[PDB]
Subunit: 276 residues, 4 copies
């Protein structure tokens, strides 16, 4: 087990080459935000953009496009009803995040089915929140599981793995990871990442981050990191570590840590660690 520290950040966050263009920094499609939870996908989008993703496209209810553009004009917006366009943006994506604010309805199930069906070996797929629940209910078989990332909290991991909370032990968690062949970012008070290699144990987090939207922000950072950096699980560990490092720093002054504040801090923190 590797216990995370700033060295993960110096490892993962590379200085950009002088002659770089947007697409070098990845195309991300974020999918979520039903009519009640549009804010969730807006928080993931803000995190993704602030993290350095080259191009961010958001598939979300058209209700949410207006407030999303008020806060995140850098994002392209596609509604759930724009079937041809949404299919196209997903095909062209380097990274797909599905789940923030997604909910559990039929359109949600169809989009997940479509994403999974088309998933290609070169694409990262992050399945978060209610998308983990849908995936668990639908008996899918992943074509390229090594490129799928699940970000469950402990209750979603019970749904996915059948491990009850008390049995969510290092060895049992690893065995269920192995069964899937995917990366499991098991979110908790101290988040642990299970994969083909040596698990990563996060060392930060505070209860001031126990507020709505914190996981949406993390998912957006993970997507942005996978858009830009080496396609190894260390990159995901870097995202996880940075999310809580900024949170822990904010918590020194702020009783609750608003997720937008974590996103807004990303450019200055990343510059600090970018490998010289």
């Amino acid at each position: 087990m590797r216990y995370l520290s700033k060295d993960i950040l110096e490892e993962v966050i590379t200085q950009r080459p002088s002659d770089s263009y947007k697409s070098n920094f990845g195309r991300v499609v974020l999918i979520g935000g039903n009519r009640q939870y549009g804010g969730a996908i807006i928080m993931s989008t803000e995190a993704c953009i602030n993290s350095g993703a080259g191009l961010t496209t958001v598939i979300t209810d058209v209700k949410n496009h207006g407030p999303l553009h008020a806060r995140c004009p850098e994002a392209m917006v596609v509604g759930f009803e724009e079937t041809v366009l949404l299919t196209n943006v997903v095909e062209q994506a380097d990274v797909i995040l599905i789940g923030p604010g997604l909910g559990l309805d039929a359109t949600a199930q169809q989009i997940l089915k479509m994403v999974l069906a088309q998933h290609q070996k070169q694409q990262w797929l992050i399945i978060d929140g209610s998308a983990i629940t849908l995936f668990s209910q639908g008996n899918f078989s992943l074509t390229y599981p090594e490129k799928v990332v699940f970000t469950p909290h402990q209750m979603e991991w019970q749904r996915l793995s059948h491990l009850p909370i008390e049995q969510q032990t290092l060895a049992n968690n690893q065995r269920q990871q192995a069964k899937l062949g995917s990366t499991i970012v098991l979110k908790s008070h101290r988040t642990t990442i299970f994969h083909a290699g040596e698990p990563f144990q996060n060392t930060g987090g505070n209860p001031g981050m126990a507020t709505g939207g914190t996981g949406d922000t993390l998912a957006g950072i993970i997507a942005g990191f996978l858009a830009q950096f080496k396609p190894t699980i260390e990159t995901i560990a870097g995202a996880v570590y940075l999310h809580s490092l900024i949170g822990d720093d904010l918590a020194k002054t702020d009783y609750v840590v608003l997720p937008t504040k974590i996103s807004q801090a990303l450019p200055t923190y990343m510059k600090k660690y970018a490998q010289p």
Copy 2:
């Protein structure tokens, strides 16, 4: 009578345990914002989120969802027409605030009737603004009055209690409180809180806070405090005191104190007082 000072804040605002999750910090449903006064419910929402409430859901006119999400992406939004969903979020709520920007129409009366009908002993109910007027017109009998909180200004207290302004004396106020068996946050230039125990007398406030939205902010802070802290009337007194402490501090530099500024200050002030 207890005269409020910072000691109320050290008493009420506890350090969160290292292993805390969102729901530990309460589920709040805020209800209000008709088509003209949507800003009111947005200001209550901003205050509630900034105060540390775990999860905030807003039932308000669908007209208001867009600007609410532009400012408060952490909130779930439900429209007045989503009868089944709104009923469900109210049932699941730990704290319900009804009133900011609510107005006086039939839909408003029906929602209040529904809230009151379902109110359960474990839930806090805050009845604010035009909801106090509706309650006063409707001859309701509270099932669990000890868990209801009324936040009238002196004119709404006349409606509720029949005490004319000049007779709103400590002893008469207490007698009318006793008749209800509910908490009365009697808002004035120096706010006083009447309950089963020894009244609380606030010691701050300034005329720079005499601007629209100040009471909406307070109501959101009260809801957020009741979401997180001990279920005693001291928690409400803490909210009241903190609202005016921040106001009074802002008023040192600002001629008028914009309510959003009070909300934005909550995380740094709360950290200062959180009981070590």
Copy 3:
């Protein structure tokens, strides 16, 4: 002629009494913002709220309510189609500002006609921008002209007064003011205010404020000042002077002075001058 200096601010901007309530600080209705120029009325609203107006209601195209609430949640919003409500808010207003972003169409003409018809002796009426043009085209006779304020630039003053630019001399300007019996805030590189008494000559202004929205901000400050302060023309001169004082200060660092920045500075500047 009184040449304006900070002494106008110490004269006009009074310390609020300890026991003050919102309505003491006036009810303002701002009318304007057609479908193309909604931003204009949003800038006037931001200025009015920041200036300290007790209660601000905005009558503007329903298209504009969403972005207005994203920036100004303190405002009540009424659409042009809400005939009964808009009539009611105008009747109850202490100060009416009509004109920012209003345009020149029939609905615009009808609203102005309605405002003028109902104008009462206790109400301030500010006629700004395209409302000056409409007024000039419509052959109205003011019932209480001493309580009307026109805020023309030099071309609108030609429309209103028939004075060509070159003949807009102190003596001719005064004579045309006298014909109306209203206050004329003649906006220019150095704004001059004509009334029954000794004209006021502003002494600030810079070309960095020569940007769209500057006059909308001024009109909102004038409305907010008349809402709160003595009903004498000195109060209007205070608004004018403060607008350019903040502008001139911002212009020291900013090549162009964005009008929102002037509005955002009002609370700290007003505190500085409020008469001890």
Copy 4:
């Protein structure tokens, strides 16, 4: 070839005369933002306003007016369906920018055709992004090519000029410029501007600006500069240089440079260089 340095800024950015009015500082119409890419036109608008343009009007999908006004209340908004009004604002424009977020559909083609058809000798026309692609597909003949500015990246320049990337050499670029008789702002890691005179070579830029919206911001700065400053190609070089100077400064602290941050810095940077 002139290698750009701050001296271009001292040359181009003049101190405004004491007696200046908005229209002296130019009328700009920005055209773009389809239903998916509305954020692009919002970023160009923010840049144009912050740059000092007198009056900014935006022709964009009505979907985008709400978030645009939330961020940029200084702009007039016109929808693509308001045929008469949009025609009128274009006729009256001093500077037209067409392209940010425009996309490639028929309405887009018609608007470009209309703009080109009416282009008058006194107007600057900037053709950016997907408008370069449309122009390249449509076999147009420019009536006043000396007043047209193309802002291609290297792939759009291949479309326009048929020069493949490897043949985009100084001499070949100049020859293709000469064929058009227009200004070519050839965007790259080090942007070069070709015109009738001696090319301008930009000397800044960093890979932190390799993020969506950076080119939209530049286009808005170019439009704002042409609105205000001398009608020579040096003015365009000033815009280009300032865009990257601010970017390079932000990149010292920020890993990625968010385009909104460049726009927000314009007033303070321009004041620094404005020719004393």
